[PDB]
């Protein structure tokens, strides 16, 4: 799908990761996911909350599994999630920012999911 741009890459995660049921949305679930070895990826987003989690997420990535990505504008990743599953990512019924997501083995390991992460890891 993607061309290994940062923005279209995190979209490719969420599609097959949904089927894999790897999404640990919210800071508490993200923490428990990454304190476990189930996680393989961490993504953060612009501050809408306290200045504590921005520090802590780097601290957890340090000790356990380094993998972090930072992409601003919480509303992007907030839009990409549904309220259950696919059927409207527009949706004025509810849309709200995730502010952080953690994914387990970055979802299914298949096509371009593998390449997007391997592209980042060797340069970081």
């Amino acid at each position: 799908g993607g061309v290994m741009d940062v923005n279209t890459a995190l979209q490719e995660v969420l599609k097959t990761a949904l089927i894999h049921d790897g999404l640990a949305r919210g800071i508490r679930e993200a923490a428990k996911a990454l304190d476990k070895r189930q996680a393989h990826l961490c993504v953060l987003a612009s501050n809408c909350d306290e200045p504590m989690y921005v520090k802590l997420v780097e601290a957890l990535c340090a000790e356990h599994q380094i993998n972090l990505i930072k992409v601003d504008d919480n509303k992007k990743l907030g839009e990409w999630v549904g309220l259950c599953k696919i059927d409207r990512e527009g949706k004025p019924r509810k849309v709200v920012g995730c502010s952080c997501v953690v994914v387990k083995d970055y979802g299914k390991e298949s096509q371009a999911k593998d390449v997007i992460e391997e592209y980042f890891k060797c340069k970081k």
Partner: peptide
């Protein structure tokens, strides 16, 4: 979530 305390990094 204040259950994890940060004073220096990468330490948790």
């Amino acid at each position: 979530l204040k259950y994890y305390k940060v004073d220096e990094n990468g330490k948790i």
